[PDB]
Amino acid sequence: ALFELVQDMQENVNMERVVFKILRRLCSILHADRCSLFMYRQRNGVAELATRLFSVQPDSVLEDCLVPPDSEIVFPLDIGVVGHVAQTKKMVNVQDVMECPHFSSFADELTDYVTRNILATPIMNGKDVVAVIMAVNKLDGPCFTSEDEDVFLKYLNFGTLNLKIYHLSYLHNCETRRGQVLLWSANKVFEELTDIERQFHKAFYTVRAYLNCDRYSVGLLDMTKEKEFFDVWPVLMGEAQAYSGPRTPDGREILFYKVIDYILHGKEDIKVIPSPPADHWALASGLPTYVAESGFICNIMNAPADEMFNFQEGPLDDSGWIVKNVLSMPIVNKKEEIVGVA
Amino acid sequence: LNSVEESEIIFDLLRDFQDNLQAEKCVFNVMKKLCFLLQADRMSLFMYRARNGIAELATRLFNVHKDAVLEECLVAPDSEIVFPLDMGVVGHVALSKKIVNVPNTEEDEHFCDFVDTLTEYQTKNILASPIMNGKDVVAIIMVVNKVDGPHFTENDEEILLKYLNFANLIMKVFHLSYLHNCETRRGQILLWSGSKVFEELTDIERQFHKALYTVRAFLNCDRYSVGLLDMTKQKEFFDVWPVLMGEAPPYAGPRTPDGREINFYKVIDYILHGKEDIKVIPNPPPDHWALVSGLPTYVAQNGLICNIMNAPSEDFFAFQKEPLDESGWMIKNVLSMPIVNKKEEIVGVATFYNRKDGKPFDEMDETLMESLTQFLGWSVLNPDTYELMNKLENRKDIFQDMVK
Amino acid sequence: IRSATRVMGGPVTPRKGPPKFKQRQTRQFKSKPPKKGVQGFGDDIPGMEGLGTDITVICPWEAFNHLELHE
Amino acid sequence: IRSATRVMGGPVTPRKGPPKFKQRQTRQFKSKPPKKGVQGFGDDIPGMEGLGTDITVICPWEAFNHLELHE
Amino acid sequence: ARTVKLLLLGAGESGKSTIVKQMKIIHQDGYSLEECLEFIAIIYGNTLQSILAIVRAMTTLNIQYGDSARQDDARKLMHMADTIEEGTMPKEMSDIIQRLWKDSGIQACFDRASEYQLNDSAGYYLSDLERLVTPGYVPTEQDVLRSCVKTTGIIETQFSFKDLNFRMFDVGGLRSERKKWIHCFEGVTAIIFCVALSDYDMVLVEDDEVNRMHESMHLFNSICNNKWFTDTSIILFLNKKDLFEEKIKKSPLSICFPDYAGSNTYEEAGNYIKVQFLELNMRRDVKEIYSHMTCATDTQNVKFVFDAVTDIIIKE
């Protein structure tokens, strides 16, 4: 059985399949009733644990235990035994859950299931965590004995290698593309001297294949600070009202005078707008003007179910287009002055 | 040959897949048992590399017989044997990419006999197979002689193709780590050089001396040097006249591939092994430690990337054969490449010496330093605009003082 | 020092000849031919190993893949 | 069926609260704290660890650390 | 008793020699009554250099002066300070310096003093520049112990306590001066290592892109686990706790240690930094190391800690 599943890592490492066949055996060895797998990721500085395999049991198949990206459950690592394990970085064995301070019934209301005993451990690459494995619900004894805690560790030594290989392969993927974007942006930046509107259109267009997106947009800001004498007179004479909108951290007013947007699904359809209206499909949400007030890198995960901003639902395009994930960051020019937002 | 409960060799091999795979002990350990299973006398492992666009095979483990220890079968970097890709059975295996075996060497063709004199061995039988990463070959493993028979049968081929799965996995993860190790540095040097070339406008000499000083660590080399050519195409009228009238006979030296005189007016060199000593030498003499070998004045003409493997044994260039320092430091590897400036004109020559691991330069160290010089060649737009500004301003001042 | 190869002081070769030096690269075309063979570790990078941007523009009819002949 | 997690709309979460966003990256350094005990894949890259210089120049006495204080 | 040989070393510009002064002048051989003889020139030079460096960095940081007329004053200074003698502060200097410091523009630069290099004590000095410029000024002892000068050579100090014979050596903290450490390595009984708590967002003088805390940790780890000093013990000292108390609220700890989380207090991060400075020791239980906080200019804590240190040296 071990020589098989080593014959399966010959080419195109299959993270999902081999771990499934390891778990189907580890569930039978321990006399447990269920098993699981949680993945680790970081969004805007905070860490969290998603779900990748749920309710694996000895006679199930791969199609009924693989969780797509939409039917997920995300746990911050200050809630539950999973969070406690991923924070302390040590094995945990819980004979009864009625006493442990760290426990959550959130996952028991959705699935209609009751848990009594728990056994979990992390999986480490150097000093980092990569995943967490659980062995809920033992069938014969009152709780897991002490002799199983060594079978667990000595049998997960093979799955540790596969998960480390997967994690390493993923890091090779995201560093190949960082060299290419820099090289092919320098190539089109050092061609000639030009104004700002043309550099950001030549350089953002020739790397559209490495960025794996469907739409992205760039907005430019005005750079004039002090007004003229013949414009400050009406304010001081009661003719008009003073400005009351948002202000860039160095005092300027926030108004966009150009918007370059790209569409990359179906048609290329590059566009330029000389003066954006009050409701463009980019400026309407309000994120590009909240980023300019205070320079922040923002990362929203479920856009249609958010409250601070307003990403109205219903397709913007005939083909059917719903925003689900958004990222936006400012552009600074070595003098700590914002110049645009992407 | 074996029994069924007797196959606990599988467990013995799995026991080492625990942590910190050194990628050298594991291969040795699997070979030391594959030697017993096949009933062979010797085994060996050749590794694959490419220099100058031409492939090569270099030995990494040699004479790994039964009941041997690791320290007497590991080949040092400077005691190797290098084979071209067309000579010998190893070359044939690498070209065809399929397992082969010869019942008798003497009758068979393209069997070389170079090693049989150095190592005084007879090599009556050979059986070899390659290991692939998918469209690419990563190493070759060979077995020589048989313990008590005519030749290897088919059952031995079955045994080898069964027990090679534990090495196809070890050798492939040792290859990915190298690619990751090179991509990281290629990203970092571009980012950090872009930090320093966008800080201020200035002349060419300062820009190169601020962009090459920041990346000492990422290029693990002992010494490297950069030389700058002169860009004066055509001289004035009062300098041509002495030639056309019968004095100062005309120039005789070399010329760039667009017509010019090869003259180095500035040379920058860095020393990073003993103690950091950055120097700048204007109008260098023709016996400076970089210009004596004649390599940087040969790259400027042809414009070819040149890679040399064993300098004290090369005949065409005549390097030095004695230490150049109080401590014993001698040249062993060299790599040189030109710098172009968006109009296919050569503007300088860069040279790197003595990689810090004892091993020669290869493909993954050619691409990195080719990208570095491409970026440096593209970045010469800024120093020209400095001159254009410093001329426009003065011309404006003169014409504004004429109206007063 | 046996060294297992009986050689010390520098690498040795079976044959020697005049040196050959590599040539630069100028054109730097973007696209690549279609991919064949077994995959292996270290492939499937999105930006690389592809022609243009997407399949749909290359073959506009390919969108109607699931449909039968009659339509 | 229902994908075994019984959720079909989108990612659900136990916690609730105000969003928190990241600060920009202002200043950079070439240095890292000295290494910890255990290492894994991808933690030996030259130039990405240490202070950018060999330990000899920072601590010259460590050069001939083999010989003791007798001399 | 028979002999005690102490060595003082640590990161450069950490207040090593301030302890030498705070011991010798305070306790043995008496204080220096005629302190003005050196302190006049020393403090004048420090106060001039600080306000020269701030205005030199004003242009680099692009901060613009609070008032238009100020733009004149600085220029005059940068011309009239060149041809002046040393240890003299004429009224033409003091007037310009006080007028310049009386601005809301220089405060903007002084708030961000991490980017460039200035002496730390200068912030205390210049505010009372008039007290210096008045004739007959003899400095106070607290003002005496806040002077600054580059400890360069090897100097022998003889403390006295517990009826012992003491010999204290100290050395320069720059990279070049580190070669001289080897001579005094042989035949020692204890070693003292100094760390500055405030320097978690600064850069080295020699190298512009190296942090200071990392430099100190790499220096410590080398000799901490060495076998040359296996027999002897090591005593760790932490200085500049006052500026640490001031600053620790202003800026996060993420810049120096990237993965820290929480809220910073004068004591929450102290154990963080101490445990990270002591984990580097290899022999966990074979040998032990002790570290104490210290304000070098003060005398109460010096008396509190130095006698305990000497007692612990005696106990073994």
Ligand SMILES: Nc1nc2c(ncn2[C@@H]2O[C@H](COP(=O)(O)OP(=O)(O)OP(=O)(O)O)[C@@H](O)[C@H]2O)c(=O)[nH]1
């Ligand atoms: N505010 C404050 N400053 C201190 C304290 N301790 C030392 N200093 C500063 O440290 C300076 C003296 O240190 P140095 O003269 O450089 O002595 P050193 O540590 O041997 O460093 P080098 O002289 O360069 O070798 C004084 O000018 C003080 O400003 C302290 O507790 N609080």
Ligand SMILES: Nc1nc2c(ncn2[C@@H]2O[C@@H]3COP(=O)(O)O[C@H]3[C@H]2O)c(=O)[nH]1
């Ligand atoms: N129904 C079901 N619940 C699980 C499974 N694995 C873990 N859990 C539960 O999900 C919970 C998530 O966090 P927890 O509160 O630390 O304790 C966990 C268990 O109660 C599983 O495979 N099936």
Ligand SMILES: Nc1nc2c(ncn2[C@@H]2O[C@@H]3COP(=O)(O)O[C@H]3[C@H]2O)c(=O)[nH]1
């Ligand atoms: N002494 C020795 N020679 C070997 C070994 N393995 C291969 N060779 C020899 O090296 C030769 C290299 O090229 P070849 O012509 O394929 O035939 C090969 C064998 O003669 C080994 O393990 N020990």
